[PDB]
Amino acid sequence: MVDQATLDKLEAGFKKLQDATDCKSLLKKYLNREVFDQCKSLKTALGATLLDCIQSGVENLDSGVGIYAPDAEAYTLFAPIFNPIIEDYHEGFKPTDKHPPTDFGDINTIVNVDPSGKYVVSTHVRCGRSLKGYPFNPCLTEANYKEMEDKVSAIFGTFEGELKGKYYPLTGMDKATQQQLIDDHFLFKEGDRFLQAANACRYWPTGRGIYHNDAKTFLVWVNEEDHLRIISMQKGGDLKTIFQRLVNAVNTIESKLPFSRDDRLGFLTFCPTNLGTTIRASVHIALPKLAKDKKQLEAIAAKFNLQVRGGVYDISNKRRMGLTEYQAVKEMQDGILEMIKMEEAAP
Numbered sequence: 001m002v003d004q005a006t007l008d009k010l011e012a013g014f015k016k017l018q019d020a021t022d023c024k025s026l027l028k029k030y031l032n033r034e035v036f037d038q039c040k041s042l043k044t045a046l047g048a049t050l051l052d053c054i055q056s057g058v059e060n061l062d063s064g065v066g067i068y069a070p071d072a073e074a075y076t077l078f079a080p081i082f083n084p085i086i087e088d089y090h091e092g093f094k095p096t097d098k099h100p101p102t103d104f105g106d107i108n109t110i111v112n113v114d115p116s117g118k119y120v121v122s123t124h125v126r127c128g129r130s131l132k133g134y135p136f137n138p139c140l141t142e143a144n145y146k147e148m149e150d151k152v153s154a155i156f157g158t159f160e161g162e163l164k165g166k167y168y169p170l171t172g173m174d175k176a177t178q179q180q181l182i183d184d185h186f187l188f189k190e191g192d193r194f195l196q197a198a199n200a201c202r203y204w205p206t207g208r209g210i211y212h213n214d215a216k217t218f219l220v221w222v223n224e225e226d227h228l229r230i231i232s233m234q235k236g237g238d239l240k241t242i243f244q245r246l247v248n249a250v251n252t253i254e255s256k257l258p259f260s261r262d263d264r265l266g267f268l269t270f271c272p273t274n275l276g277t278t279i280r281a282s283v284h285i286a287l288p289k290l291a292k293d294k295k296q297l298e299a300i301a302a303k304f305n306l307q308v309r310g311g312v313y314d315i316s317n318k319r320r321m322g323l324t325e326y327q328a329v330k331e332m333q334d335g336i337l338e339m340i341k342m343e344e345a346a347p
């Protein structure tokens, strides 16, 4: 049962969201009274309540989304509020829809997106994973964090080949090590107010750490937002080598530690934006001609299901759910190939 103290905070939060007439989060949009009354008295098997989902969007009213998952069960148990937010954010992933089974596909159909070297500065493929049996960061204990780091660092120690590298615990990290990792853009810090209000940064820095291979083309963040954030990257556009490295790595990890995955949602993540494939495939790319009209540059990316962010821009696949890991990477690749064709043919 939910304790009366949590029920009281929940009721105060619900009212606070209705009184913020100018607040525009997805949480506020879909947390109406009936959805709230459906959910407020539920509790997962690991002890997570609705407050462990919505507290950050109650405390930060400028949140774009405003909800996080405190454990894997919370996605199903609290479906009445998660499902409409997931649908909205992922642009048509309905409550009755289903994400495909995992498929990394035929890696040999993946190509270098810019053999010319003229346009793509670097290419990157990011994924995320939760480890089966562990709550998510809102509900992990100090002992969980410690035990998880022990198991994860043990696995990283077995990496050989191009994956062989070093684990750096944040606990007891010295300032020279930190500066070394900042220079590599490999360091993460305590979360901002959105994560703080979500109870994601408790017992910092216990259980948090960084791994990277000697080549500095592979990086893992442990307990930064998800249990594991796994990135493969390098200069140039060799998406084939990059993606295959990521897959080798994820498969190696999985062989020792099972992941949390849902038949409807795919891979379960702390934020609902990272569900499904979890894949974020991107290039840092300069398109001088196409970009001299940023509205049309954004329009062009938008036609290939791409998102432009921060001369050199980050262009990535917008879609995470409803498509396989292969299809997601292939969509970035085909979109980038086309935009380069356009840039090369533009006057």
Ligand SMILES: NC(=[NH2+])NCCC[C@H](N)C(=O)O
Residues within 6 Å of the ligand: 056, 062, 063, 064, 065, 066, 067, 194, 225, 271, 273
């Ligand atoms: N982990 C993330 N990037 N989540 C996306 C949303 C972040 C923040 N809670 C917001 O809703 O604005």
Ligand code: NA
Residues within 6 Å of the ligand: 089, 090, 091, 318, 319, 320
């Ligand atoms: Na989306």
Ligand code: NA
Residues within 6 Å of the ligand: 333, 334, 335, 337, 338
């Ligand atoms: Na193409």
